[PDB]
Amino acid sequence: DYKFWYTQPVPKINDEFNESVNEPFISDNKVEDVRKDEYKLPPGYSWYVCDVKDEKDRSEIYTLLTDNYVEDDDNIFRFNYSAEFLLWALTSPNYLKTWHIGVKYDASNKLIGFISAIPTDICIHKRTIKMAEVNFLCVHKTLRSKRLAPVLIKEITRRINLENIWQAIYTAGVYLPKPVSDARYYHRSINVKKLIEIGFSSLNSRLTMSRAIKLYRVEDTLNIKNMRLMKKKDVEGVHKLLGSYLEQFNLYAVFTKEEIAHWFLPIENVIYTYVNEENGKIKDMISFYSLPSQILGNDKYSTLNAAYSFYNVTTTATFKQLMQDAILLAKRNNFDVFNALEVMQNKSVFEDLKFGEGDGSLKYYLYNWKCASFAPAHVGIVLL
Ligand SMILES: CCCCCCCCCCCCCC(=O)SCCNC(=O)CCNC(=O)[C@H](O)C(C)(C)COP(=O)(O)OP(=O)(O)OC[C@H]1O[C@@H](n2cnc3c(N)ncnc32)[C@H](O)[C@@H]1OP(=O)(O)O
Ligand SMILES: Cc1nn(C)c(C)c1CCOc1cc(F)ccc1-c1ccc2n[nH]c(CN(C)C)c2c1
Ligand SMILES: [Cl-]
Ligand SMILES: [Mg+2]
The missing domain is CATH 3.40.630.170 (Aminopeptidase)
Structure with a gap:
């Protein structure tokens, strides 16, 4: 059904555009109109701004991903990105610390969720657009299928929109509406x-x-x-x-x-x-x-x-x-x-x-981009 994704500016499953179309779903966005309030989390959980240049905060993200990040479909393998890799992946030029977003469980003070973005210029069908590259979305295994992932997505979208950025690029192994490739x-x-x-x-x-x-x-x-x-x-x-x-x-x-x-x-x-x-x-x-x-x-x-x-x-x-x-x-x-x-x-x-x-x-x-696949x-x- 994609009940969350269908509320977003992305293609519907049956959408097909020709090469003459290469533009946002929603144009003329205004930074002044962006929500200034953080999205609401379930009781007992809080946003945390992770400092990836701090070894201890970086170690916390490392632990979260080591135990809870992507597995192959047969649950044979789980990615184990190193702490030094995460430093490199997240501190590229003009990165924002406020786009490295954790969620903690208040009672334990433990990180249970993460999402990140870095800024990059992306050329799509010959038009260059300032975009965010989104990566490392993770929810702890014990908290899956509670609709936390849309909260993390909406929160990073809001923080990216504050920077007058209205497009993003992302990859995943799961099928979502709708791949460009x-x-x-x-x-x-x-x-x-x-x-x-x-x-x-x-x-x-x-x-x-x-x-x-x-x-x-x-x-x-x-x-x-x-x-x-x-x-x-x-x-x-x-x-x-x-x-x-x-x-x-x-x-x-x-x-x-x-x-x-x-x-x-x-x-x-x-x-x-x-x-x-x-x-x-x-x-x-x-x-x-x-x-x-x-x-x-x-x-x-x-x-x-x-x-x-x-x-x-x-x-x-x-x-x-x-x-x-x-x-x-x-x-x-x-x-x-x-x-x-x-x-x-x-x-x-x-x-x-x-x-x-x-x-x-x-x-x-x-x-937020419509174009030919x-x-x-x-x-x-x-x-x-
Ligand atoms: C302008 C700026 C825009 C910025 C934002 C751009 C968009 C960025 C989008 C993020 C790009 C991330 C790039 C990467 O990091 S890809 C790597 C993603 N990480 C993992 O696979 C790690 C292991 N899995 C998990 O941690 C959880 O299963 C995750 C967190 C993935 C989902 O948690 P959970 O399983 O507990 O589910 P829920 O009940 O909370 O949420 C269910 C909703 O979430 C939709 N869903 C599930 N998986 C993904 C996915 N990989 N991308 C986008 N959406 C996803 C799903 O279709 C459903 O929506 P709908 O079907 O009902 O509609
Ligand atoms: C080995 C192995 N270990 N794991 C955990 C997987 C899924 C594999 C299969 C090979 O996967 C690949 C092999 C490649 F040559 C390139 C990419 C992947 C792959 C697959 C699924 C993914 N979901 N999230 C990411 C991370 N990033 C791109 C957003 C993935 C990266
Ligand atoms: Cl909402
Ligand atoms: Mg959840």
Whole structure:
């Protein structure tokens, strides 16, 4: 029924717009009219403004997500974003602390719910709009299906609207009204044996354990020999290479130089960016972020270490050669699996690089924006 979502400025399930339509559902909004009162929570619960730069507040959000965030549909895995990752994801340029919103249970003083947004310029069908990127919506497992999530959504919407921002971008694995695009994810095994042992990958009469290990073996030599960790000096070149590449897509962030520095400069166990510099110019880049999943109820292993493809651009090799190098660099950094969506040019390399199709898809959404939907090869953004 989508009783909440149908009250919002998003498409109805049967809405379909042609390419001539690219505009808000509701225009001419006024900051002066935005509600100044916080949304009401159930008795015994309070809003809390989280300071993600404070280790202890950050640790509280970490605990909440570690125990209560996204699981696969089979409840095999739960994402385990690290505390340092959450710091990086939430403190990008021009972030607002007041868009990092917790809910505590007053009697215990414990965080039981969270939602966040960061500001970003988003180009949708060639029009650039200031938007909020919404992420990390979480309600404690003990409080599910009590209609807390709409309260968190309405509260962050209000706080974003105070900043004269009337559009947002968000992704989720669940189907809601109504995706602008839908991208399946794919997985390239690196540590075959571990993936077999936790039930992620499978063997058969033909594909024995030794044969599976041989199938996924990689040569420890880069196609692009000088591919190296990104440094501060490379910010301008990455901004140029990536900024120009992303313009071909129907949906992408318009990164400033400060944003390139934030989103790409390497942080161990968070974000890995490699570049190929020729003549002091950056001609190729690979990036992937670290997102482990807790393995629920495996005796031997507690964590699946997974690298997630982020942004990859080549001008001196084929895309297949570049992504082969990305897999090698993820292997060199101890990742068990390399995960990618069928966005950008990714799908074209999946068969040849031995990726397997996963069990689901990630849906991309816009809030308060009507436009034509499109195939995921036309998506040029990755949300964390
Ligand atoms: C201009 C600025 C605008 C800013 C805002 C832009 C919009 C941002 C939107 C948020 C983007 C988040 C991006 C991410 O972080 S995606 C990751 C979301 N997090 C998880 O999956 C973590 C594990 N699950 C949970 O913590 C809870 O199940 C959550 C909190 C997800 C729902 O709690 P609960 O299960 O206890 O349910 P309820 O009774 O309170 O609420 C039921 C209502 O909630 C709607 N629902 C359920 N899941 C989602 C979902 N993932 N996006 C949007 N809506 C969702 C659902 O359709 C129903 O509405 P309707 O079907 O009756 O209509
Ligand atoms: C492994 C694994 N562990 N878990 C917990 C899942 C869902 C998987 C399957 C692989 O999932 C993926 C694989 C990819 F290559 C890319 C994305 C996902 C994925 C799926 C569902 C999600 N819901 N919320 C987010 C977070 N963010 C984008 C809003 C999700 C991210
Ligand atoms: Cl209301
Ligand atoms: Mg609830």
